Amino acid sequence: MKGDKKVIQHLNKILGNELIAINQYFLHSRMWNDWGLKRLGAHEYHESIDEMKHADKLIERILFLEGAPNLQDLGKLLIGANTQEMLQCDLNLELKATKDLREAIVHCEQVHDYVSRDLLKDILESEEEHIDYLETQLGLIQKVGLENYLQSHMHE
Amino acid sequence: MKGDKKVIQHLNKILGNELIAINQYFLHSRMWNDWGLKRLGAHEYHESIDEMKHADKLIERILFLEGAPNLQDLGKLLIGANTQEMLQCDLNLELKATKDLREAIVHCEQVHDYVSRDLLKDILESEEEHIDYLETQLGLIQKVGLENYLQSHMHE
Amino acid sequence: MKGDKKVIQHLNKILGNELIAINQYFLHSRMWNDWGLKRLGAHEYHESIDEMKHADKLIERILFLEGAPNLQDLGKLLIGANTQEMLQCDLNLELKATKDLREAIVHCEQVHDYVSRDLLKDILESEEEHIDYLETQLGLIQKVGLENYLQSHMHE
Amino acid sequence: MKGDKKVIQHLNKILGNELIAINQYFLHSRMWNDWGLKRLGAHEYHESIDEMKHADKLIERILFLEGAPNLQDLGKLLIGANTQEMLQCDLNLELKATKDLREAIVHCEQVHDYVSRDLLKDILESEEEHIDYLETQLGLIQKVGLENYLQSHMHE
Amino acid sequence: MKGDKKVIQHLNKILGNELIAINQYFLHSRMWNDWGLKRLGAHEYHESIDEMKHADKLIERILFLEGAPNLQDLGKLLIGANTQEMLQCDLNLELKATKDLREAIVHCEQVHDYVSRDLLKDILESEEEHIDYLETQLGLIQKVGLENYLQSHMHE
Amino acid sequence: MKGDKKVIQHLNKILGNELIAINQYFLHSRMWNDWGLKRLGAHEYHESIDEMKHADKLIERILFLEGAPNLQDLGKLLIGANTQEMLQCDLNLELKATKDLREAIVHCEQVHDYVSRDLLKDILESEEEHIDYLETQLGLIQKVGLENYLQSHMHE
Amino acid sequence: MKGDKKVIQHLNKILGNELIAINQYFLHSRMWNDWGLKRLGAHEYHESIDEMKHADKLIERILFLEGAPNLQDLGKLLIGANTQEMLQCDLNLELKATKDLREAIVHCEQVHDYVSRDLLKDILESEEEHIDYLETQLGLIQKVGLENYLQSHMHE
Ligand code: HEM
Ligand code: HEM
Ligand code: HEM
Ligand code: HEM
Ligand SMILES: [Fe+2]
Ligand SMILES: [Fe+2]
Ligand SMILES: [Fe+2]
Ligand SMILES: [Fe+2]
Ligand SMILES: [Fe+2]
Ligand SMILES: [Fe+2]
Ligand SMILES: [Fe+2]
Ligand SMILES: [Fe+2]
Ligand SMILES: [Fe+2]
Ligand SMILES: [Fe+2]
Ligand SMILES: [Fe+2]
Ligand SMILES: [Fe+2]
Ligand SMILES: [Fe+2]
Ligand SMILES: [Fe+2]
Ligand SMILES: [Fe+2]
Ligand SMILES: [Fe+2]
Ligand SMILES: [Fe+2]
Ligand SMILES: [Fe+2]
Ligand SMILES: [Fe+2]
Ligand SMILES: [Fe+2]
Ligand SMILES: [Fe+2]
Ligand SMILES: [Fe+2]
Ligand SMILES: [Fe+2]
Ligand SMILES: [Fe+2]
Ligand SMILES: [Fe+2]
Ligand SMILES: [Fe+2]
Ligand SMILES: [Fe+2]
Ligand SMILES: [Fe+2]
Ligand SMILES: [Fe+2]
Ligand SMILES: [Fe+2]
Ligand SMILES: [Fe+2]
Ligand SMILES: [Fe+2]
Ligand SMILES: [Fe+2]
Ligand SMILES: [Fe+2]
Ligand SMILES: [Fe+2]
Ligand SMILES: [Fe+2]
Ligand SMILES: [Fe+2]
Ligand SMILES: [Fe+2]
Ligand SMILES: [Fe+2]
Ligand SMILES: [Fe+2]
Ligand SMILES: [Fe+2]
Ligand SMILES: [Fe+2]
Ligand SMILES: [K+]
Ligand SMILES: [K+]
């Protein structure tokens, strides 16, 4: 079905953010597992999988709308050197992603692509849950202390 | 069955205390959940449900006794800003509530409303369990340290 | 995540309508039970639970957006003295509440809080089902007669 | 297999009556449901489904006989404004349908299309059960009174 | 264990009331069954059984306290002539019986017979439930009309 | 609940498109079954049932909003003579129908009928899935050849 | 455990090839699904998943060896425009990848990193299986014809 060219460009931009998130979260997950922080690693792995699922739905929609999904252009991964930085790197990524999602939704609405809008709203709800998770972890580090917070995420 | 007018006023006063506790504990539960302290949040939620059940029983008794349950007047909620304050606010409210229950029970005994006395003694048993839980939590914060106490209440 | 201050005001206004509904429908449910109209009583109880779940979702959203849920201010309960009045009182409250939901949705759209919009739309769908239930009951009272209508709602 | 042109014309005429009944009865069903008369609504829905099944068998037989099923021409729906009128509209429609079925059966017999006759006879049996149902409800309204009759058909 | 003579007197007085209610409710039950009002007859039968269980517990207590249970003196049965009168007769009996229960509890409390007091409170709780049932049925007759009320209690 | 008159006109217009599609796809389904192309006939039957479900939800929404569902007006069925034409006729109907859905949604949004908007968006999502199916089949005909495509849809 | 720097370089080079293959195959899978060639789509999906698992193991080994996995430098995706081109692009990628694997294995053997050699040998077995699959499909296209080959891969 012939889609709006600007919508497709937006969909491809959201896809680009997912592809960053996939790799960033996967690496952070394996870094935490490597350190023995297996509960943090397991949770970060599931964040990664969520983004893989987002990317898949974006790819399917771009192809239905007769555009070309861009999986070639991989933007800058934000890799931290410790748990506190890793969480904040993820949270910086998510905040930038939600800004792009909101702008894409505005454009879908303007050209009446309501099905793409709905897809993007679904992704956005998930990213806001991710933001909640990240803010909540950083807040817990402050309330319980870094050492306790890491202790609590050693064993699954 | 026409009840004693002052007994009914006592029952409405107990009901008013229940309505404060429902809202205060429900908000505290959701604050704890929002902070990622989900074991505290789940326990406070069950305390809130406990108060909803007390209110229900009082409402039904007031109606049986041909009174008018007052769900309109909501007294002051005591909303803490951190875990220590939230526990102490709940404890302050429980202590005021039990004082009112004791006076209601004196009046029921005086006019021979033994069934209302029984209902109020059941509520009071529950309130003293609530007090024991709150006092114990505050005690545990001093024995294990606030950061340890909060750590132990992160995960269900 | 930092929410829009006027969206948060809108959410607290919707929450305030929910808190009226919880108390109004709970009291009506227990009044119908007390009269032995158990089928009305049970249906109204489940309406009350619906509103408790709406309030919980609003409370959680407000807190995520870093606002303060307002559970302190309780508006006017509309309590009737018979089945016809109680149904019309509920219907009056739902119509007022849907007006506030629509204005809140307008604001969420204006500032691109699409997740809050979605949540309010979900609540709005529920309220329109509540309206449909209430209008239908008032219509059945006209079609079958009041005494028949009440007879059919005596027994669960 | 090449059918008789006038038989196929008869079959298309019966189908056209089925198409009126599907729509008329589906609308009456949803109106009854809308008014909270859910037992009437459910039973009319099932009458609707029966007519859909009649239409299906007629379409398959027309195509086997190398005819062209006519789903384009929709005759006049008879929509009532209250229960008594809706039942009478349905009955009026059934009685016209059975007149057409009988004439179709005569023609099938005359040209030895015995399998078509058998299908039409099966449909006619169902229409006569529909007629019995409708006549019987109208009699019950008279015997038990309209308000009682509607009361008995509120709840499934 | 030697009981207080006046407590035992009180218990025999309560037992006397139980014996009236057993026969009164049993007869009313069989009258309603005989008339084909089986739902009323079944519920009245269960009230009779309740009173039989009360009598059993009073007999057992009197014998433990080394008194002599009095099953010989049967007070006046109030037998109604129609459903309304029968419910009112039952309600008159219950209200008179709760008056004697309260005076017995006062005396139990006065001589520290706290176990007998607890037994009488449990009975009194059952009697207020019986009162609620009877009051509610009389109220339902007013709200739905006598003929509707009886119709709804023909079939179990 | 009194709805917006132009919204109801839009819903009745969507309903009109559903009624065309019901009959068109049902006839196409039975044509495919009659030719022994049973996998195409079964899938087309399921499209037809999807449309009946859309029609049902529209009818229910129109009645709730106190409008009059129009099941009387049946637009022009596009009936093809072979598989390729039938698929294109269906595709042409869907593309016309999504146009009317988009315009109906614009109007719902403008008058704040957010529940009607959500219902139409759900229908639109389904229609775009239908378009995807149709376009894909026409594409497979080109990629595998007509004879291979038909062969693959003989047997369920 | 400190690993050989040049081994880690080899592992990151292998990882770079996995990352290309993941994206290329995932996009080829979804292109096939979009065209209705769903057997090809599912199989290419599972190839993509295989590469994700190769990547994971490489990432884990690199971290264990105190290296930094490189997920940032995504090489050129080879995207075909039709089934034959897509298969050949995949085969070209696999053949380049196996040459890098053989060179990495030589180096692991030279420095006695026999655990790394074993992991690479397991990956190599899988790539050779991937090569066999792809060569076989290209051969079948020649033996059965392109249209037959695609036909056979439409339905799962
Ligand atoms: C460095 C890049 C990637 C890595 C390491 C990776 C890793 C993984 C792993 C380990 C799994 C679980 C496989 C299993 O054991 O079942 C998985 C699943 C999956 N991947 Fe990836 N992945 C990557 C990139 C991608 C991309 C770019 C996409 C899509 C565009 C994607 C789509 C999926 C999907 C759909 C699943 C299955 C999710 C489900 O459970 O439903 N992946 N990935
Ligand atoms: C007059 C005030 C209230 C009364 C009498 C009341 C009563 C009740 C009762 C009887 C239950 C079922 C408890 C059980 O047996 O499990 C319940 C459940 C619940 N209440 Fe309340 N409630 C009140 C206010 C509230 C408020 C203000 C909120 C939230 C802001 C709330 C949230 C809930 C929730 C979430 C549930 C569980 C619902 C479920 O089953 O999923 N309630 N309430
Ligand atoms: C106003 C037009 C129509 C409406 C609203 C309607 C509605 C429905 C609904 C709601 C169902 C149940 C679907 C499910 O939940 O599985 C159904 C089933 C069905 N419909 Fe219709 N329908 C319409 C027209 C037609 C026509 C014109 C035909 C045939 C000529 C037809 C044939 C069927 C058949 C065969 C079934 C399956 C029934 C069974 O075996 O249970 N429908 N319809
Ligand atoms: C001193 C007077 C009476 C006492 C203490 C007494 C006690 C009891 C008790 C303890 C039961 C068992 C109830 C249960 O736990 O389910 C019972 C059952 C019953 N009683 Fe009595 N009762 C008395 C008089 C009567 C009378 C006067 C009638 C009838 C005219 C009656 C009719 C019945 C019946 C029909 C049952 C059910 C027995 C069954 O299971 O078939 N009772 N009674
Ligand atoms: Fe995402
Ligand atoms: Fe396509
Ligand atoms: Fe834009
Ligand atoms: Fe969605
Ligand atoms: Fe995310
Ligand atoms: Fe955690
Ligand atoms: Fe360990
Ligand atoms: Fe309480
Ligand atoms: Fe009462
Ligand atoms: Fe007092
Ligand atoms: Fe008790
Ligand atoms: Fe309490
Ligand atoms: Fe604890
Ligand atoms: Fe609500
Ligand atoms: Fe937060
Ligand atoms: Fe506003
Ligand atoms: Fe939602
Ligand atoms: Fe509501
Ligand atoms: Fe009853
Ligand atoms: Fe028919
Ligand atoms: Fe044929
Ligand atoms: Fe004829
Ligand atoms: Fe037959
Ligand atoms: Fe019929
Ligand atoms: Fe009902
Ligand atoms: Fe008794
Ligand atoms: Fe003894
Ligand atoms: Fe005494
Ligand atoms: Fe007891
Ligand atoms: Fe009693
Ligand atoms: Fe549709
Ligand atoms: Fe309505
Ligand atoms: Fe318009
Ligand atoms: Fe929805
Ligand atoms: Fe469609
Ligand atoms: Fe065959
Ligand atoms: Fe690989
Ligand atoms: Fe290590
Ligand atoms: Fe080397
Ligand atoms: Fe190995
Ligand atoms: Fe490979
Ligand atoms: Fe197919
Ligand atoms: K009646
Ligand atoms: K072939």
CSV table of C-alpha atoms and ligand atoms in Angstrom, one decimal, chain G residues 25 51 94 127 130, ligand 45:
chain,number,residue,atom,x,y,z
G,25,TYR,CA,19.2,-12.1,7.0
G,51,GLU,CA,23.9,-15.5,13.8
G,94,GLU,CA,29.0,-16.7,4.2
G,127,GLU,CA,28.4,-21.5,8.6
G,130,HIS,CA,24.5,-22.3,6.1
H,45,FE,FE,26.2,-17.9,8.7
